[PDB]
């Protein structure tokens, strides 16, 4: 994980500054989701039939 | 001493040929068996 750089002094210094600015640590994120589900149901059936 | 043969300890020569082509520009060659 190395960079090999060849350039004159001024370009070298500029490139080293850019590398130093881009070579930094990243933070982390813990992400939590929450799913809630509720269901309710009620029914009634009533009837009378006549037959012969 | 226009020519040298370098024995590598930890790296692979085929890997270093590509890297050193730019820096050299001069001939660079790799012997894989040794």
């Amino acid at each position: 994980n190395s960079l090999v750089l060849t350039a004159p002094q001024d370009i070298m210094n500029a490139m080293l500054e850019v590398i130093g600015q881009l070579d930094i640590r990243r933070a982390q994120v813990l992400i939590e989701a929450l799913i809630v589900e509720m269901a309710e149901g009620d029914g009634i059936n009533l009837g009378v039939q006549w037959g012969s | 001493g226009n020519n040298r043969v370098v024995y590598l300890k930890y790296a692979k020569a085929e890997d270093l040929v590509e890297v050193l082509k730019g820096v050299s520009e001069v001939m660079i060659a790799a012997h894989a068996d040794t």
Side-chain angles (χ1 to χ4, degrees):
Chain A
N1 199 51
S2 321
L3 287 170
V4 183
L5 308 166
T6 179
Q9 213 51 59
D10 50 290
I11 303 166
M12 194 79 288
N13 287 358
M15 275 207 282
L16 289 183
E17 265 289 55
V18 168
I19 289 160
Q21 263 160 359
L22 287 166
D23 195 46
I24 50 162
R25 200 188 197 119
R26 298 145 73 185
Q28 298 177 100
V29 198
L30 168 67
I31 299 140
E32 313 182 71
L34 181 60
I35 316 144
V36 198
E37 216 295 276
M38 302 193 91
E40 227 160 10
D42 215 36
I44 183 159
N45 284 28
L46 198 180
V48 181
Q49 300 188 75
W50 298 82
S52 156
Chain B
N2 205 358
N3 327 103
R4 309 265 306 238
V5 173
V6 175
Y7 303 118
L8 302 170
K9 313 179 247 54
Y10 302 104
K12 227 200 302 310
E14 161 210 44
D15 285 6
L16 293 196
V17 161
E18 320 331 325
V19 165
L20 285 168
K21 278 321 281 163
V23 175
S24 84
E25 298 261 55
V26 289
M27 224 38 69
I28 321 278
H31 193 222
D33 260 26
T34 40

